[PDB]
């Protein structure tokens, strides 16, 4: 074995988990072979890695990678092509057969037949927030990453619960500073002074009765990921329910 490699599959909750095996012909056989080649007056080898594709299942299909693969042949390089893989709905882990081939055109144009094709198990190795009191769940129908200027915009929230008491929630945005190491002492304040100053909710204390279009305008600009001021609350048995979801860039 010469080309040392690793299998990296990264898991995302946008129903995607990409795969990019990294390869690098490391020093272990290089320290011997590039001194035999140094005795034979060569220090720029070229193993023509040009043929490589993946396999998904028993239907061994070449999945279309997100990146390209031309004739890659140089000395001491290292490559990691990224391939889009569909994320499963559960722990159905598709074992995979990583196939590759490099035709080792050595010094004095000496080709050598070699390939790197083997199989393993391609495990990854690892919107909505639920309630605390009721069966209520909160999601935003409009997409949680959205573009706007400093002007007005429409924002829309899902309320789905059990219809045993299907009512009496209230919103309020609570535009005041949470009053709160010295650089962290002026970091938590500058977090809170742009939470409570950025957007303003133009219909607060909105009685809900499912669907409601909540009404904001934002003043100053930035990335308001998990815009966390707004609090709905159940008027019986008052618990501070929070919706820490959604985002808004203002450029």
């Amino acid at each position: 074995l010469l080309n040392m490699r690793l299998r990296n599959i990264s898991l995302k909750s946008e129903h995607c988990i990409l795969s990019s095996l990294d390869f690098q012909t490391s020093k272990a056989s290089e320290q011997l072979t590039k001194k035999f080649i140094y005795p034979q007056e060569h220090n720029s080898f070229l193993k023509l890695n040009f043929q490589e594709i993946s396999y998904k299942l028993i239907d061994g299909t070449s999945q279309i990678e997100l990146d390209p693969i031309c004739p890659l042949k140089v000395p001491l390089t290292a490559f990691s092509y990224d391939s889009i893989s569909a994320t499963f709905k559960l722990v159905l882990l598709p074992k995979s057969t990583q196939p590759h081939r490099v035709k080792i055109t050595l010094a004095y144009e000496l080709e050598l037949h070699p390939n790197l094709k083997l199989p393993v198990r391609t495990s990854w190795e690892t919107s909505l927030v639920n309630s605390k009191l009721s069966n209520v769940k909160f999601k935003f129908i409009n997409s949680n990453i959205k573009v706007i200027k400093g002007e007005k915009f429409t924002m829309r929230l899902q309320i789905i619960n059990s219809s045993s008491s299907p009512l009496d929630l209230v919103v309020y945005y609570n535009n005041t500073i949470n009053p709160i190491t010295l650089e962290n002492q002026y970091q938590l304040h500058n977090k809170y002074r742009k939470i409570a100053e950025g957007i303003i909710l133009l219909s607060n204390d909105y009685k809900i009765p499912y669907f409601a279009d909540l009404r904001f305008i934002g003043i100053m600009s930035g990335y308001y990921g998990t815009l966390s001021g707004l609090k709905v609350l159940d008027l019986n048995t008052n618990e501070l329910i929070e919706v820490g979801n959604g985002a808004s860039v203002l450029i």
Partner: protein
């Protein structure tokens, strides 16, 4: 604007600040509508009197 039968509409009225070197906000506080009366002790701390004058 328009408000139908329950629909609140938050009016966003822009103003300026005030300048503390232009008005004195420590003047005779809570002036009575009619002069005179009993003239009883305030029964409050002077600092409290300051913040009551500003908040009025």
């Amino acid at each position: 604007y328009h408000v139908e039968a329950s629909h609140t509409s938050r009016i966003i009225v822009p103003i300026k600040k005030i300048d503390y070197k232009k008005y004195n906000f420590e003047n005779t506080p809570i002036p009575r509508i009619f002069p005179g009366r009993q003239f009883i002790q305030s029964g409050l701390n002077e600092e409290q009197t300051i913040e009551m004058r500003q908040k009025f």
